[PDB]
Every structure is written in C-alpha cells, then in structure tokens.
Design a protein around this ligand. Structure first.
Ligand SMILES: Cc1cc2nc3c(=O)[nH]c(=O)nc-3n(C[C@H](O)[C@H](O)[C@H](O)COP(=O)(O)OP(=O)(O)OC[C@H]3O[C@@H](n4cnc5c(N)ncnc54)[C@H](O)[C@@H]3O)c2cc1C
Ligand SMILES: Cc1cc2nc3c(=O)[nH]c(=O)nc-3n(C[C@H](O)[C@H](O)[C@H](O)COP(=O)(O)OP(=O)(O)OC[C@H]3O[C@@H](n4cnc5c(N)ncnc54)[C@H](O)[C@@H]3O)c2cc1C
Ligand code: SF4
Ligand code: SF4
Ligand code: SF4
Ligand code: SF4
Ligand code: SF4
Ligand code: SF4
Ligand code: SF4
Ligand code: SF4
Ligand code: SF4
Ligand code: FES
Lengths: 94, 178, 89, 380, 339, 129, 11
C-alpha cells in the first residue's frame, strides 16, 4: 500500500491515508514494533506460543537514529532500493 | 499568549507552490508569536516530537499549524499538544494545502500571499482562544444487531463470545437470511 | 471488533463547542430556544440556560442573539470578527 | 360585543373627556374595583403642546388626564418594559404603542397577562414646536391661545380658547412641510386591534366613544365597567359601522400613497444618504428611543463595531447592523427620527426595509403575535 | 415621575426629562417642547440622570488628622466663617450655580472683603450679544473657531441648518480632522494666530463668530477684532451656567491662589492647584481630600435660573428631592452671612 | 483591479466541498479567503456587514444542501438571514451581486470551483466598491 | 476479533 501512488476506485492518495496508521502503530503503548526482523521458531499451542525472532543487524542504532539522512547524503556507494522495485537507486545506507 | 507557529512543507505538496520560508518568517514577526518553525512532515512522529519539545522549552501556550485541512489532522495535533500538557482547544489550524496550494498552482505569488493572509487569520483566532475541558460520557457495553442473516449471526456470536450482551432484531419469524 | 473497541474503552469524549449564556447580559427574550433543533436551551430564573448533553454546537442560537448574551465556545463572535478583520487587513 | 358606543356614567369625566370619556371611566373602574394596580397615561404640561407620561396609582383626580393630544408623539412600550414590567397595569396606547408592546411581549420583556391595553384610534400626531410654528405661520394666531387640536375632516382644526374653530387642509399643511410627522403619514394602522380594546370617534356620536372589543380580556373589562356602573354603553348602528370601515379604508389608502411617496419616489438618493450619514455624531439617540432596541447591552457599542473616533461612523456597522437586528420588526413609530440631533431621516430607511421583509414573508411587525419568520424553528 | 430639567453636561441649554421611580432617578425622557433642542440630546444629555446618585457625598466633612471625617453643619459653617474673617480666602466658582446663588456669592465677597475671587473661565468679560441659536441659520457668513459640534452638538445642529440655508462657514482649529473640519465649507489648520485673523478680514459686517474654548489665546484677539468690526460673537463656555454666573461674578484673572474656597455644585471644576487650604462645596469629593467639605444639592434638586451660552435663560423647579443632610448653596451663603 | 473576497463555509459540507475541489486539483482564483464555521447557521448579517466595511468587495457563504445540514436545520436560518441581507445591502450602495450564498455538498468540488470562478469574475467586473 | 475471543475468555 505504501508503494502505490493512488488507490482505485477513488484515486485518493494511498500514503496520505496510510501514514497516520503507521504513526499510530509506531507510537502505540500496546504495540511493540520489531522491524527488519524475521520469525525463526514457533513452538507450543493456542494461548501458549513461544516465538523466537531474530532482529537482523541494521548497523544503525534505532534508539539514536533520527532519520535525518545526512549519512545517506554522504555515502558514496549506490545500490538498488527495494521500495522502488528495481527502477530506483539509493545508497548503501538508506 | 505565547503563540508557536509550525508551517508544514508536506514534502512538496505545500512547499512546491508556497515558500515555507517566507511564510514562517512572517509568523515569527506577527504579534504574540514566540517561535516559527518549518518541518517536512509535521503529522509524523518527529514533527509531533518537535512540537512537544517546543511547548516544553519555550513555554508556548498557543499552537498554530499551517498544514492540510483540519478535518484530516485536527485530532492528531490536539492529542499531540496534550501529551505535552497544553489544553487541546488552544490549538489552531490553517488550511494552506487544500485551500491555497493545490488550487493556485499557476499563481505561486498569489498562493504565498494567500498563505500569509490565512496564517494571519489563524493567529488572530488563536489569540482569543481559551481552555475548555471536555466532558467524558460512559459507553454502554451492549450491542444491537439488526438482521439475522449470516453476517448478523456472525456479528452477534462474535460479540457474545467477547463477553458483551447483544440484542439481535430480525424482521422475519426465523433467522438464517438468504 | 470495531464495535467492541469503544465498549472496551468504556468512555468517549464530548466536544465542548457548546453555547454559553451570559446571565448578566441575557434579557430572557427567548428568541434562541426554538432555534435549537435539539431543545438544548431552556429558561431558568428568566435567563437562557443550555443543556450540554442536548447541545451539539451548531451556533445558530449564538448567531440569532442580538445582544450577544449567547456565545459559542471555540467560535466566539470576537474570534470570527478578528478573522474577518485579518482577512482584509 | 365586537361593538359598543360607551360613555362615562360620571358627568365631570364626560365633560373633560374627548369623546364622552369612556377611556377615563374604564381606567377609573380598573383602579377602583382593582383589576390593576396603576394606570399609565398622558397629562398635559403647561400647554397643550407639552404632554408628560403619568402613572396614576389611584383614581382621585383621574380627570386631569382626559382629552387627546395630537402634539404628543409619545411611546409607552419602552417605559413599561424598562420600569413597570412587574406591576399589573392598564395603559392607553395608540396603535404604535400597542405595536411596540406586542413586539416586546413576544420577547418576554412584558408579561401579556399583566398589561391591559385600552388602545385608541389614531390618525396621526405632530411635533410640538413644529405644530406651534405652523399655527403662527398658517392660522395667523398666537400658538398660546389654542386649547385643542383635531384632524377629523381631513382638516387640522385648532380650537381657540374663546370658542372659535380654525381649520386648514392637512393636505395643504403637509405639502408645505408641516402637519403630521412623516411616519404618521405612512402609518397603515389606525385602529389598535393589537390592544384589548380599541376606542375612537369614527363610528361614534358626539358624546360617545366607539369601542371595538378585540379580546375577552377586553370583554371582561367592558362588562365589569358597566356592571359596576362606570360606563353606559349601547349598540352602534351598522350604518355607522360601515362609515367607520370606509374611513379606515381611505386612511389606509392614503398611508399607502404616502408610503409610495416617501419610500420610493422622494426617497433620498445614495449621494443624499451619504451626505446625511456624514453628519451622524454616534450619540445613539435613535437606538435609545427605539422601542424594539431593548437590549441590556447593545452590540453597536462593542469594540469591533463601535466607532471610537470623533467622526461620523460608517453607516454599515451602525445602521445596517441595527437593521439586521430589528428592521423586520420596525413598527414605523418615528421616535428614532424624532430624537436624532443631526436631523437624519432614519425611519424612512427602516420602514422601507421592514416593508421589503413584510412583502417577502408576510410578517407585520407589532401585529403578529408570533416571532418573525427569522426566528422560526421549523424547516419551513 | 417625569419632570422637566436642564442638561448640565455642557453650555447648550438643552432640556431633558428625568424619570424618577420611588424618589430615585431611573431614566431620561425626551423634552420635545424645549426650544433649544426640541427633545434631541447627545449621549451626555441622556446620561445626565445618573449624576445625582454617582458618589454623592451627602454629609458635611471636616479633615481630621490625615483624612476627612463626618461633622454636623454648624461645626463646618463655623471653621468656615473664621477662615473667611481671619485668613486670606479666595473664592472661586464654576459656572454651575444658579443666577440668584451667584448674586448671593457676590454679596458675600464684598461682605468679607476678599480681594481675589471670580468665575473660573478662559473667556474674558465681553459684551456678548444675546443670540437665538434658532437664528444661526440666518447669518450669511459664519466663522467657527474650535470644534463646535463636539463642544455643543445641538449648536452644531444649528450650524448644519445654516449650511443647508446657504451660509459659508469657515472653520479654524489646530487640528484638521475634527467634526467641524470634516463638515465645514472650508477648514484651516492654523499654527500662527494672524492666520485666522487675516481670513476674518474677509467677513462681511454682521457675520457670526462661534468660538469655543479649545484655543484660549485666540479668544482675546478674536473678541477685539469682532468688537472693532461689528461681529456677533457666540462663545461656547465650559459650564451650563457660565454666562449666568458671569453676569454677577467676574472671571478670575488671578493665579496666586492660597486658602481657596471652590464652589462647584456641578462637580465640573478641573483640578485646581491649592497652595494653602482647600474648602470644597460640591456634590461628590471624588478627587483629592479637601480641608473642608460642604455637600450641596444637585443642579436638578435646586430651584433657580440658568443661562446658556446663547443667552437663553431657564427657570427650574427641583426635578428630584435633595438627599437628607445636603443644603443648597443659597442656604450656605445665607447662613454664612447670618453668622 | 483585484477584488477582495471573504468566504464563510460550514465545516461539514461546504468546507468539505472546498477540500474536495482542492484534492481534485481544481484551480480557481486566489482572491477568496475561507473562514470555517460548524454550520451556516452560525453566520449572521453582522459578519457580512463587517466584511464589507473592512474592505471586502465580495462575500461568499457556503452551506449544506437544504435537508443535508449536519445540525438538521441551521441552513434554513442562514437562508432567511441571507435573504434579509440581500434586502439590506443595496440601501448602502453595495450591489447584491457582491453577496453570494450557495449550497455546496462535501463531494461537490467542481461546483465549488465553478462558483468561485464565476463569483470572482462578477466581482471583478463590478469593480472596486 | 477472532484472536481476541480466546484471549478474552482466558482459558
Ligand atoms: C441466488 C443466490 C445464490 C447465492 N449463492 C451464493 C453462494 O453459493 N455462495 C455464497 O457465498 N454466496 C451466495 N450468494 C450471496 C449470499 O446470499 C450473500 O452474500 C449473503 O446471503 C449475505 O448475507 P447477509 O447476512 O449480509 O444478508 P441476508 O442473507 O440477506 O440476511 C439479512 C437479514 O436481515 C434481515 N432484515 C432485513 N431488513 C431488516 C430490518 N429492517 N430489520 C431487521 N432485520 C432485517 C433479513 O430478513 C435477513 O434475515 C447468493 C445469492 C443469491 C441471490
Ligand atoms: C393622537 C391621537 C389621535 C387620534 N386620532 C383619532 C382618530 O383619528 N379617530 C378616532 O376615532 N379617534 C382618534 N383618537 C382617539 C379619539 O380621540 C378617541 O375617541 C378618544 O381618545 C376616546 O377616548 P374618550 O374620549 O373615551 O376618553 P378620554 O377620557 O378623553 O381618553 C383619552 C385618554 O388617552 C390618553 N391619551 C391622550 N392623548 C394620548 C396620546 N397622544 N398618547 C397616548 N395616550 C394619550 C389620555 O391620557 C387619556 O387618558 C385619537 C387619539 C389620539 C391621542
Ligand atoms: S546521520 Fe544517519 S544514522 Fe546518524 S542520526 Fe542521521 S540518519 Fe541516523
Ligand atoms: S500535517 Fe498535513 S500537510 Fe503536513 S505532512 Fe501531515 S498531512 Fe501533509
Ligand atoms: S437570545 Fe440572547 S438575550 Fe434572548 S434569551 Fe437567548 S441568550 Fe438571552
Ligand atoms: S448551538 Fe445549536 S445546538 Fe447548541 S443550543 Fe444553540 S441552537 Fe442548540
Ligand atoms: S405612527 Fe401611527 S399609531 Fe403612531 S402616532 Fe403616528 S399614526 Fe398614530
Ligand atoms: S442594535 Fe441590536 S443589540 Fe443594540 S439594542 Fe438594538 S437589537 Fe439590541
Ligand atoms: S427603527 Fe425607528 S421607526 Fe422603527 S421601531 Fe425603531 S424607533 Fe420606531
Ligand atoms: S440619533 Fe442621529 S446622530 Fe445620533 S447616532 Fe442616531 S443617526 Fe447618529
Ligand atoms: S448638546 Fe450639551 S446640553 Fe445638549 S444634550 Fe448634549 S451635552 Fe447636554
Ligand atoms: S452544517 Fe453545513 S449548513 Fe448546517
């Protein structure tokens, strides 16, 4: 949904309506968001699931990074951006 | 009244037509305004953090945001101010995206003048705003389900299994629907 | 799920954009009561009194009041007058 | 009893009464048999051009208030609403007085249950000083020397003290800028049907007052006064009722012609109106005199409207605001124009606006019991 | 309930009616029969009814240590008579007494042989003609010095009537946006006095000069010019009976006041410097603490005559009852003479 | 000549109509200045007269369609007030074509655009007040 | 909703 420009059948902006929900998720007291991570093991049963997740190394501190983007501006290496689906470029840090 | 003004670029949706530098500069110079700042995406978490930090530091008691229509994000900025201690009703919204920037693309200068006038009107209104405590009302923990088809049956069973007492009104002598 | 959310919360907030009467200015003319479609306005001690539960905040009664005893919260006459003045000056 | 001819059973009240003294006898009965606590009426001052309101709490010497005063364009509605809104009252009202009282009652500024309206038929009034000047210039007499006035023949008729009568055409005096006030010439209502009783001399014999009973409160007043032996009354002809009807219709036709004259064809131009508005000193005499402008605090004095400099105010934020506030309820009483220190014809514009509103919506100010359609709560 | 009276707010002789309810003034009513204004009043005329009730001090007051404390009338009339006989007392009055009271004050002044006394007014003693304001419209040429409309709205009304009659009205002032400046046929914003006097040379004989007190220094020269040159001068004095008091009492032209006795029943006196003692005879102390205070009846609670600027004299019976303990200035003067 | 225009729009439909016009990118002249009210019933003649006295060359009011008011019947009261205002304005030299009031629904962006354009053309043709 | 039902019941 975040990659779409508009949405049918209303041709309304997709991001304009999705971003508030993303912010709500990011700042909800009852939600713990773990991005750049994958579910590795699931054991147990209903009410009693033990889940082991691996958070991949960003090499960036999530608590300290403000997403200002200076590192992106200064990086010299270009690489494809997954968000652009193979037609857009970004830096090694993005 | 210590008014803090926050002009949103919205990327290039206001910025591209309206000069979010000339508009912030006027707001800083208008009477009673103690800060004027611009941020790329104010509704996002960093923008709300900036507003809260400004309120805490400079002691702003009035918040004016030059951003999209209030019908979209007025509740957002209202809960923002409160988490930082201000009353929700001390905040004002200036509509410079749907009313100014998206409808006067061929007149950037007229667009900027209109944005200046709209921010002036917003600050004029915000000067005279006062706190208002909103009243809470209890929510009855009961549900009514009109229609006894598959959808209504599913809704009633889901509500009843979650613990809520539910009424199901059906016009036919029996439930089932189509 | 959506209907359960508020019922789990158990409370909702009412907006305070409601009419308020200045008893010291109000003359009890009563040209405001009939203008409320919800009957939020009554007369007590010869002065207009607004019920918060019934009032919804349209501002019709405030616009009708000649002397200005009635005023809407968050949409006061002085605020709109200041906005009109700033729009042209 | 839509109809009676009545006169005071007393003989002093008949002698000093204008048309048999039925109004004074009714007031005497009301104070004495206690329907009411006080009577609000007029009393002449040091001449017939000086009329002063009087509040009589007892009927002793009630005879001092008898007689009509066409040089006393007074308003009683605001007096009642400001000072006497708590007492049980009986008041003598010309049609404009009754119109003001009705506009105030529907705004709960007067209690209808408390005020008894003995209204009087009215063919118009004159300003005192202007009337004195007109009588010196066109009647060739000293203003002191007259003791009564009347306008029945279509002639203004002064009664010298000696016994003689001087009559000149009211039509010829009005054409010369004298006679009745301009608002009186436009007045459409001659018979106060918005009062409990309507008393006049159109359908009446010499020595008698023609009384139309509009309400059952008036019916109670009449039957109490005659049961108590204060007024003797009998039935009008039904030849005289039609004469009174024709007289009313022709005055009404004249008022419609004068309305066309003053409001359309001799209405001031926009340049003339600009010249007039340039005079205004922002004294608020018009608003103070206006019976419909009763508010405890007036919006015209707010900072965002009030003109704080010593110059003529913008006629928009003063006159247009007052018009939007009450012009649909303007009763064309002419008090605002009477009291204006700058001699501005305010009543003209206010009456024209009210006429537009009445034509559109059919609301007649001071006659309808209900509020103007402006204040309707229905989806109409 | 409704009683005729004079408006005390300015020197125009406008008539009003006071509506009294149960002994107190509650409202105003139009006095349509009065010739000066025919029932038309400015805001002050309709507000005058509140004066008798506002801060009325109704009790003789002698200044105890530091402050002013109540006292009986005899103990004040004494400690006033001794002040008259012993010390150098100068009697100053405003144009708010009745004509008869001014005559009585003149009688007192010679009896106690005071050297400095008179009426507080910036106008000099002149042979002012008796002009009917209703005749202002007759003059072909009218020169207006000062904002006459603001000073006296109901005389500006007659100026407007004159304008509609064909007259040319020249206005002169140190400001260029006053009401007269806006509505005058021609306005001049002079900074030097020969500027007004030179344009006055063009007036025909028998022209009107309506002069207000807004420009004090011009009054003398303009009156001299009008006297040489035959112009009818209409002043706009400060108080509602400045003319009436001027007839009996001269304008104080002294400036060395000590131990002054101010007689201001209308409470119209401006702050006057007192080098010595301060006797105050008014309806309300408001102001500063006086050494002695003699409460008096209000203008409408008296019986007597008042003269307007135009020269119209009006004889009045009380419109209200004077509150208990207050005496008319006439009673004070008679008792002081008797003592 | 660039006329000065002041607009009053109800929060629920007319303000929504202007928002719809903006989102659809419907261009119109920038002279109008919109002031938000909860309902068109909040508007009275004092605001219109103040706007004209302060220098406005045109005044627009937008409301819900009759029968579509959020608050049920405010727009009826506004309609009555607007007719009376059209009566009053010409008496002081203000053409009633300088005072326009329309019913705009929240989804009628194109109608709002056309109204704005046509009102601007009318007011400009009339010239300064 | 379906996941909340078991968690609301708690057993
Ligand atoms: C011929 C046909 C074949 C179909 N075959 C299939 C199929 O094979 N598979 C499939 O998945 N879908 C099929 N559908 C679609 C399917 O019927 C619907 O998706 C489904 O029935 C919708 O259920 P519902 O509860 O929303 O409405 P309904 O089944 O219509 O039930 C609505 C209920 O509300 C009641 N009601 C109505 N008004 C009121 C009122 N005012 N007050 C109270 N109660 C009221 C009705 O009486 C009824 O009890 C078919 C539809 C048709 C017409
Ligand atoms: C200005 C005026 C115009 C009139 N025009 C007509 C007319 O054209 N045709 C007609 O048939 N009748 C007219 N009347 C009334 C007519 O004179 C009645 O027959 C008469 O008033 C009935 O009273 P009466 O003789 O029974 O009693 P009275 O005892 O003579 O009654 C007169 C009473 O009315 C009060 N009053 C007098 N003048 C006024 C006034 N100006 N305002 C208010 N109250 C006042 C007096 O104080 C007194 O109490 C007019 C009356 C007035 C005052
Ligand atoms: S420079 Fe890069 S890593 Fe550092 S705070 Fe900014 S975005 Fe984050
Ligand atoms: S506040 Fe409004 S204008 Fe600014 S970024 Fe968010 S949606 Fe866009
Ligand atoms: S309209 Fe105003 S004055 Fe009249 S009752 Fe209502 S609040 Fe009071
Ligand atoms: S604002 Fe509207 S809902 Fe509220 S009391 Fe007035 S008319 Fe009623
Ligand atoms: S306005 Fe009508 S009722 Fe009043 S005095 Fe004139 S004619 Fe009589
Ligand atoms: S102008 Fe309006 S507020 Fe003032 S008294 Fe008249 S109706 Fe009341
Ligand atoms: S506006 Fe004038 S004519 Fe109309 S009711 Fe008021 S005072 Fe009478
Ligand atoms: S009475 Fe005349 S001068 Fe006074 S405010 Fe009204 S219009 Fe202006
Ligand atoms: S002009 Fe002077 S005397 Fe007449 S009402 Fe005004 S202040 Fe009083
Ligand atoms: S809410 Fe738009 S008109 Fe009532």
């Amino acid at each position: 949904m975040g990659q779409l420009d508009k949405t049918f059948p209303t041709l309304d902006c997709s991001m304009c309506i999705l971003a508030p929900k993303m912010v709500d998720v990011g700042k909800h007291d009852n939600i713990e968001l773990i991005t750049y991570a994958e579910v590795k093991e699931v054991d147990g049963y209903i009410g009693n699931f033990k889940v082991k997740i691996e958070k991949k190394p960003r090499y960036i501190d999530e608590e300290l990074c403000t997403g200002c983007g200076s590192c992106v501006e200064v990086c010299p290496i270009e690489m494809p951006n997954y968000f652009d689906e193979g037609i857009g470029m970004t830096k090694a840090v993005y | 009244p210590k008014i803090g003004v926050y002009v949103c670029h919205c990327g290039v949706n206001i910025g591209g037509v309206v000069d979010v530098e000339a508009v912030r500069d006027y707001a800083a110079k208008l009477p009673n305004v103690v800060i004027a700042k611009d941020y790329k995406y104010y509704c996002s978490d960093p923008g709300q953090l900036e507003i809260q930090k400004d309120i805490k530091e400079l002691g702003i008691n009035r918040v004016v945001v030059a951003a999209c229509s209030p019908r979209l994000h007025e509740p957002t900025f209202r809960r923002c101010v409160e988490e930082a201690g201000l009353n929700q009703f001390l905040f004002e919204f200036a509509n410079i995206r749907e009313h100014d920037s998206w409808v006067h693309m061929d007149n950037p200068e007229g667009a900027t003048e209109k944005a200046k006038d709209l921010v002036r009107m917003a600050v004029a209104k915000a000067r005279l705003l006062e706190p208002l405590e909103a009243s809470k009302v209890s929510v009855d923990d009961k549900a009514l389900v009109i229609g006894g088809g598959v959808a209504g049956i599913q809704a009633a069973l889901d509500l009843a299994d979650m613990g809520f007492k539910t009424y199901m009104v059906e016009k036919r002598p029996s439930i089932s629907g189509r | 799920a959506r209907a359960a959310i508020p019922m789990v919360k158990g409370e909702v907030e009412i907006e305070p954009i409601i009419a308020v009467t200045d008893s010291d200015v109000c003359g009890g003319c009563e040209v405001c009561i009939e203008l409320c479609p919800f009957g939020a306005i009554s007369i007590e001690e010869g002065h207009a009194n607004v019920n918060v539960a019934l009032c919804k905040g349209c501002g019709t009664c405030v616009a009708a009041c000649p002397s200005g005893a009635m005023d809407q919260q968050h949409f006061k006459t002085e605020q709109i007058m200041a906005q009109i003045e700033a729009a042209l000056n | 009893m839509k109809y009676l001819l009545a006169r005071a059973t007393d003989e002093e009240i008949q002698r000093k009464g204008e048309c048999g003294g039925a109004v004074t006898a009714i007031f005497k009965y009301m104070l004495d048999k206690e329907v009411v606590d006080a009577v609000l009426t007029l009393e002449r001052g040091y001449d017939v051009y000086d009329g002063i309101p009087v509040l009589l709490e007892d009927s002793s010497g009630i005879e001092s208030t008898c007689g009509s005063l066409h040089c006393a364009p007074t308003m009683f509605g605001d007096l009642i609403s400001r000072y006497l809104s708590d007492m049980r009252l009986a008041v003598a009202v010309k049609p404009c007085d009754a119109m003001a009282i009705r506009e105030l009652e529907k705004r709960h500024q007067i209690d209808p249950d408390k005020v008894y309206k003995i209204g009087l038929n009215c063919g118009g009034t004159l300003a005192p000083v202007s009337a004195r000047e007109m009588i010196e210039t066109f009647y060739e007499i000293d203003p002191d020397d007259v003791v009564s006035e009347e306008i029945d023949r279509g002639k203004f008729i002064v009664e010298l003290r000696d016994g003689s009568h001087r009559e000149i055409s009211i039509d010829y005096l009005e054409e010369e800028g004298f006679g009745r006030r301009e608002n009186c010439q436009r007045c459409e209502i001659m018979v106060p049907r918005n009062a409990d009783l309507a008393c006049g001399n159109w359908g009446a014999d010499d020595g008698w007052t023609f009384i139309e009973v509009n309400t059952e409160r008036g019916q109670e007043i009449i039957e109490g006064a005659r049961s108590s032996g204060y007024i003797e009354a009998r039935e009008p002809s039904e030849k005289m009722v039609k004469i009174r009807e024709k007289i009313e219709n022709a005055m009404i036709s004249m008022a419609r012609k004068f309305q066309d004259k003053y409001l359309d064809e001799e209405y001031p131009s926009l340049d003339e109106w600009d010249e007039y508005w340039k005079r205004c000193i922002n004294c608020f005499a018009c608003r103070d005199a206006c019976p419909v402008c009763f508010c405890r605090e007036c919006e015209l004095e707010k900072d965002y409207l009030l003109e704080s400099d010593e110059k003529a105010p913008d006629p928009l934020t003063f006159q247009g605001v007052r018009l939007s506030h009450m012009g649909f309820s303007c009763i064309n009483c002419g008090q605002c124009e009477d009291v204006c220190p700058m001699d501005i014809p305010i009543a003209r514009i206010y009456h024209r606006i009210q006429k537009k509103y009445r034509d559109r919506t059919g609301f007649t100010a001071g006659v309808s019991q209900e509020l103007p359609p402006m204040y309707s709560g229905e989806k109409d | 309930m409704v009683k005729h009276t004079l408006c005390p707010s300015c020197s125009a002789g406008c008539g009003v009616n006071i509506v009294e309810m149960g002994g107190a003034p509650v409202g105003t009513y139009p006095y349509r029969r009065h010739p000066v204004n025919e029932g038309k009043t400015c805001r002050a005329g309709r507000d005058c009814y509140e004066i008798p009730l506002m801060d009325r001090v109704t009790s003789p007051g002698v200044k105890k240590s530091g402050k002013l404390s109540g006292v009986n009338w005899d103990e004040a009339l004494d400690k006033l008579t001794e002040l008259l006989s012993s010390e150098d007392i100068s009697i100053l009055t405003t144009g708010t007494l009745t004509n008869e009271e001014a005559l009585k004050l003149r009688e007192i002044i010679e009896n106690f042989n005071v050297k400095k006394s008179g009426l507080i007014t910036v106008f000099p003693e002149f042979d002012y003609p008796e002009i009917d304001i209703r005749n202002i419209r007759d003059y072909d040429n009218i020169a207006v010095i000062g904002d006459a409309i603001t000073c006296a709205p109901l005389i500006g009304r007659r100026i407007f009537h004159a304008m509609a009659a064909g007259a040319e009205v020249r206005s002169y002032d140190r400001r260029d946006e006053t009401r007269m400046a806006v509505n005058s046929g021609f306005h001049i914003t002079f900074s030097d006095e020969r500027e007004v006097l030179n344009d006055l040379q063009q007036l025909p004989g028998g022209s009107l000069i309506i002069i207000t007190p807004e420009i004090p220094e011009i009054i003398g020269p303009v009156l001299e010019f009008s006297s040489e040159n035959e112009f009818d001068v209409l002043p706009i004095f400060e108080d509602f009976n400045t003319r009436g008091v001027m007839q009996h009492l001269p304008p104080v032209n002294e400036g060395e006041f000590d131990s002054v006795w101010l007689i201001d029943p209308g409470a119209a006196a401006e702050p006057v410097d007192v080098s010595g003692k301060f006797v105050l005879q008014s309806i309300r102390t408001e102001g500063l603490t006086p050494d002695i205070f003699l409460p008096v009846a209000a203008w409408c609670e008296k019986s007597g005559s008042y003269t307007s600027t135009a020269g119209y004299t009006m004889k009045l019976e009380p419109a209200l009852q004077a509150p208990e303990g207050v005496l008319s200035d006439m009673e004070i003067f008679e008792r002081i003479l008797r003592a | 000549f660039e006329p000065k225009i002041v607009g009053f729009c109800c929060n629920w439909c007319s303000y929504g109509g202007a928002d719809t016009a903006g989102t659809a990118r419907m261009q119109y002249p920038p002279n109008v200045r919109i002031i938000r009210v909860m309902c068109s019933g909040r508007v009275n003649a004092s605001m219109i007269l103040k706007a004209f006295s302060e220098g406005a060359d045109g005044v627009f009011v937008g409301g819900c369609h009759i029968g579509d008011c959020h608050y049920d019947s405010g727009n009826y009261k506004w309609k009555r007030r607007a007719r009376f205002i059209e009566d009053i304005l010409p008496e002081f030299g203000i053409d009633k074509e300088r005072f326009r009031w329309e019913w705009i629904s929240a989804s009628e962006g194109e109608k709002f655009q056309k109204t704005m354009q046509e009102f601007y053309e009318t007011v400009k043709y009339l010239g300064p007040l």
